[PDB]
Write an enzyme that holds these catalytic residues in place. Structure first.
Site, PDB file in Angstrom:
ATOM      1  CG  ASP A 185      -1.800  -1.230   1.292  1.00 52.64           C
ATOM      2  OD1 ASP A 185      -2.295  -1.711   0.251  1.00 52.64           O
ATOM      3  OD2 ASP A 185      -1.952  -1.744   2.419  1.00 52.64           O
ATOM      4  CB  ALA A 186       4.337   2.188  -0.427  1.00 50.72           C
TER       5      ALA A 186
END
Ligand SMILES: [Mg+2]
Ligand SMILES: [Zn+2]
Ligand SMILES: [Zn+2]
Lengths: 65, 48, 258, 54, 152, 94, 283
Positions: G4-5
């Protein structure tokens, strides 16, 4: 709060074309035709003019000196 | 220590000495809110 | 052999085909134009009065964003180390009205805003804005303010459309509508991909086995456009000369090892 | 032979001794830290501390 | 996975031991590479996640092939201390050499490792059964015989 | 631009090139790969943040020519190609 | 960009993308104590106890108030004020100036002088701070997808579509199937369709423009109905093997900025009772 000078993605200067676009689109002319006339081919620039909202005009009423 | 100030409502010149002032107010309008005006010295800002 | 063919040419855009070149050199040229070609841009601002609704750091950014013309003859724009010459832009405004880029007064007649209609800030009654802005040469990799334009390219491909398709006439009409050069042949229709050409949904089945594609090796359709700081030909020439200067410097440093 | 607890305890004692002023029993590269000096002495096998086991 | 952390706003603390004995304890007992195997079930806890597995599948899938520049660049990027490329797996048209993903992946494994099992992509048990039979009949099959029956 | 040698052998050369990035590194390695006497050559950025300007190189040859000589040949070919592209650009643009 | 970066373009950030400003207001009263003793706004003399370094009074006026538009740093004094002494000393004045928070920084924006309900002077100072996006700043779409900036990439390294588009943001394709947010994928198509046709697209809950209409309209404009475009790798300069889904998505910058979360303590002060380190970033 005011129209940005250049498109965030490609960098083309579109700061001067906002008022022209708004006036012509208000007059009745088709927005896509107005954008194509102004020369904004890539939709990265067209997004910046289509989604912009003028918010400098309602904050000028409060002054701080 | 005399200094200049700007009123909150009318934005006019108010000159007052807070250290000795007891009733802080703009003389033109009863407002008790005043600004401290920006100094006139040049200031440098990086255009980042 | 190496050759260049022009396809389109207008005020602030150039479209040309580069042939005989490996992908590495083309990408190097694109990156050099994007990041290495230097221009003038505002880098430091000295405000004296600012009563506008925008803070100093926003007006400074807006000033920096404005393109400024860059003379080509006076400076060695292809040098690997740039000059530190400074040009000062001054402005003083008051009262109701929109402050335009055309209101900036320059010290040097050769360095001035390209577009005189860019808004900067709206001023009300009793508001004043006085400042001095300093512009200096800089490269396009340290900050985006110094970019000379925008460049991209694509492979030079020919899309082959077999006439065995029942309704290839619609594909030909669509290709001519898009403005691509169409060279009809026997059993096969040739579409030159000057601009991207995506086949419609109904013809997606014919892709590959019948609608196949051919990539002409070492040929790329370049697209270069500018905001007006420099002519496009000067931009390309400067990038190409920087590419030679870097190689010469590498030769010198490598020879230093012996 | 050695449990990891014993190894950690021995290295921790040697590093503190070296830091407090005890001489190093093996040559070391310059600029090394006392903990690395103790670890070097250890894997080189020069350990003057023994462990008591019931 | 050991920290159960994802980069969606998580904050994590850091501590600095101040004494030599504490530093030695942290260095010897608490090194990350010591705790690859979880004590809860005797299996690995540190391992590839998401893109690691996906890229591994993309590299080792059937039909994957790479060119000279791709192989050299990926080996240099991985940090492998190679100084001579292996023999090309196949030759493309126009005479370009090509290397399969299996050959590239094999350069990371220890020189004497041997193992066989069934992965989650098993869908036709007959293919796996044939390979198991071939390996069982002789504990060292001919590689050119396995490559005819290779199955993902 | 600086050349900082990391290690070298009879036919191996490994060096940093400070002040550069992918723009020149990729072109240089792709020019090198044309030389038939280069057995292995590649570059990498050891970290996209701290080593953004320090691409590490490795050049290995078969012993016919010195790696430092192959680098000279590649850098000269780059210059010739750039100049001959510039001439065509000048002649076509006007 | 794993786990989720997200990855953001440097040039777009430098051109004014997600750039924000932070405000904080400080307050200072000139209290009037019993017995006639009172505080006072003034420059603290070196004699007074608690007098911090002269370095921190660099930006004060003779009336005891900071000059607006002057840049300040950590623990810089905004309002100089002295208080009546404490009987353990005597003939002294405690230094009770109001200072910037220990880890904050910015420029003084405005200074206001008023009178409280009791007539005592009241001074409020607001400090503004520019916040350019950096690593660790949190971004979230309105479909519940959130993340932090993992890397800031130069523009020439970012891949570009063969139609001339450079992504403003790159997200991992791995969170999409697990999160099951098809609405974000539909909004991606709808945004580009709206930006290409020149007018906005209605996205009302149960009566919005259907997906099939948008897919056909996108094909009408000349693009592929799947929303996939061919891109070229920004480093090697050659096109990627697979077509890439690219569109326009509304994204929001959250007020969870790393500039307000980072915190480190070397020795600090200690609590009175337990003699242990204090609690919180502010102290
Ligand atoms: Mg989390
Ligand atoms: Zn644009
Ligand atoms: Zn008043």
């Amino acid at each position: 709060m005011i129209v940005p000078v250049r498109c965030f993605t490609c960098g083309k200067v579109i700061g001067d074309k906002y008022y022209e676009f708004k006036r012509r689109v208000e007059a009745g002319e088709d927005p896509e035709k107005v954008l194509d006339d102004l020369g904004l081919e890539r939709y990265c620039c067209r997004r910046m003019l289509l989604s912009h909202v003028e918010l400098i005009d309602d904050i000028m009423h409060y002054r701080v000196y | 220590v005399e200094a200049v100030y700007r009123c909150f409502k009318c934005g006019r010149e108010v000159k007052l000495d807070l250290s000795i002032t007891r009733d802080l107010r703009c003389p033109y309008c009863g407002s008790k809110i005043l600004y401290k005006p920006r100094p006139k010295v040049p200031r440098r800002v990086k255009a980042i | 052999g190496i050759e260049v063919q022009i396809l389109e040419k207008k005020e602030d855009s150039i479209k040309f085909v580069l042939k005989g070149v490996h992908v590495s050199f083309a990408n190097a040229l694109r990156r050099t134009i994007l990041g290495e070609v230097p221009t003038f841009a505002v880098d430091e601002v000295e405000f004296y009065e600012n009563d506008s609704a925008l803070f100093d750091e926003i007006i400074a950014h807006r000033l920096a964003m404005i393109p400024l013309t860059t003379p080509v003859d006076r400076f060695e724009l292809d040098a690997l180390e740039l000059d530190d010459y400074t040009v000062t832009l001054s402005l003083e405004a008051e009262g109701p009205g929109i402050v335009y880029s055309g209101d900036l007064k320059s010290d040097d007649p050769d360095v001035k805003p390209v577009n005189p209609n860019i808004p900067i800030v709206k001023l009300a009654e009793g508001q004043r804005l006085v400042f001095n802005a300093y512009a200096k040469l800089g490269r396009g990799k340290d900050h985006a303010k110094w970019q000379p334009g925008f460049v991209y390219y694509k492979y030079y491909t020919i899309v082959h459309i077999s006439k065995s398709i029942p309704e290839w006439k619609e594909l030909k009409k669509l290709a001519k509508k898009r403005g691509l050069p169409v060279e009809e042949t026997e059993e096969e229709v040739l579409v030159t991909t000057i601009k991207p050409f995506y086949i419609p949904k109904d013809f997606e089945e014919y892709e590959g086995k019948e609608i196949w594609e051919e990539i002409v090796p070492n040929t790329y359709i370049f697209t270069v456009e500018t905001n007006g700081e420099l002519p496009v030909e000067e931009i390309v020439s400067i990038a190409l000369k920087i590419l030679m200067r870097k190689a010469d410097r590498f030769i010198s440093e490598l020879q230093k090892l012996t | 032979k050695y449990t990891r607890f014993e190894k950690a305890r021995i290295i921790g004692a040697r590093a503190l001794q070296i830091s407090m002023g005890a001489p190093v029993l093996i040559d070391v590269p310059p600029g090394i830290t006392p903990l690395e000096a103790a670890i070097l002495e250890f894997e080189k096998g020069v350990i003057p501390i023994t462990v008591i086991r019931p | 996975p050991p920290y159960n952390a994802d980069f969606d706003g998580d904050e994590m603390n850091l501590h600095v031991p101040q004494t030599e004995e504490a530093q030695a304890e942290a260095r010897i007992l608490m090194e990350v590479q010591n705790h690859i195997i979880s004590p809860r079930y005797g299996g690995p806890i540190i391992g590839g996640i998401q893109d690691h597995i996906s890229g591994g599948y993309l590299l080792t899938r059937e039909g994957a092939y790479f060119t000279r520049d791709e192989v050299e660049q990926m080996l240099m990027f991985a940090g492998v201390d190679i100084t001579e490329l292996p023999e090309p797996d196949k030759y493309d048209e126009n005479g370009n050499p090509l290397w399969s993903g299996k050959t590239i992946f094999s350069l990371l494994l220890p020189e004497d490792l041997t193992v066989w099992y069934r992965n989650k992509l098993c869908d036709e048990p007959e293919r796996c059964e044939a390979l198991e039979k071939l390996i069982e009949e002789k504990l060292m099959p001919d590689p050119e015989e396995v490559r005819k029956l290779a199955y993902d | 631009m600086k050349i900082e040698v990391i290690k070298k052998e009879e036919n191996l050369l490994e060096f940093y090139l400070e002040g550069e990035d992918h723009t020149f590194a990729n072109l240089l390695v792709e020019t090198l790969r044309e030389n038939p006497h280069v057995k292995f050559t590649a570059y990498t950025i050891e970290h996209p943040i701290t080593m953004a300007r320090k691409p590490r190189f490795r050049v290995v040859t078969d012993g016919e020519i010195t790696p430092e000589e192959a680098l000279e040949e590649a850098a000269k070919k780059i210059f010739e190609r750039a100049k001959e592209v510039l001439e065509a650009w000048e002649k076509a643009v006007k | 960009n794993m786990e989720d970066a997200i990855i953001i373009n440097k040039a777009s950030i430098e051109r004014g993308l997600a750039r924000s400003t932070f405000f904080r207001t400080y307050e200072a009263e000139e209290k009037k104590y019993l017995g006639g003793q009172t505080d006072k706004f003034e420059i603290p003399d070196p004699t007074v106890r608690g007098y911090r370094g002269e370095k921190y009074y660099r930006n004060l006026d003779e009336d005891g108030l900071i000059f607006p538009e002057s840049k300040v740093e950590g623990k810089d004094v905004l309002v100089g004020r002295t208080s009546p002494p404490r009987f353990l000393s005597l003939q002294e004045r405690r230094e009770t100036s109001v200072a910037v928070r220990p880890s904050e920084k910015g420029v003084v924006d405005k200074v206001i002088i008023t009178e409280t309900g009791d007539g005592t002077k009241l001074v409020k100072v607001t400090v503004r701070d520019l916040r350019i996006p950096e690593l660790g700043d949190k971004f979230a779409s309105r479909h519940g997808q959130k993340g932090v900036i993992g890397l800031i990439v130069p523009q020439e390294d970012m891949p570009w579509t063969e139609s001339g588009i450079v992504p403003d943001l790159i997200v991992n394709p791995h969170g999409i199937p697990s999160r099951m947010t098809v609405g974000q994928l539909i909004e991606a198509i709808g945004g580009k369709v709206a930006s290409l046709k020149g007018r906005r697209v209605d996205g009302t809950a149960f009566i919005g423009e259907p997906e099939e209409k948008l897919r056909k309209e996108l094909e009408e404009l000349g693009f592929k109905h799947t929303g996939r475009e061919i891109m070229y790798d920004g480093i090697t300069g050659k096109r990627l093997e697979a077509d890439i889904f690219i569109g326009v998505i509304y994204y929001q910058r959250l007020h969870h900025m790393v500039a307000d979360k980072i915190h480190a303590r070397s020795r600090g002060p200690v609590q009175v009772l337990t003699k242990q380190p204090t609690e919180g970033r502010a102290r």
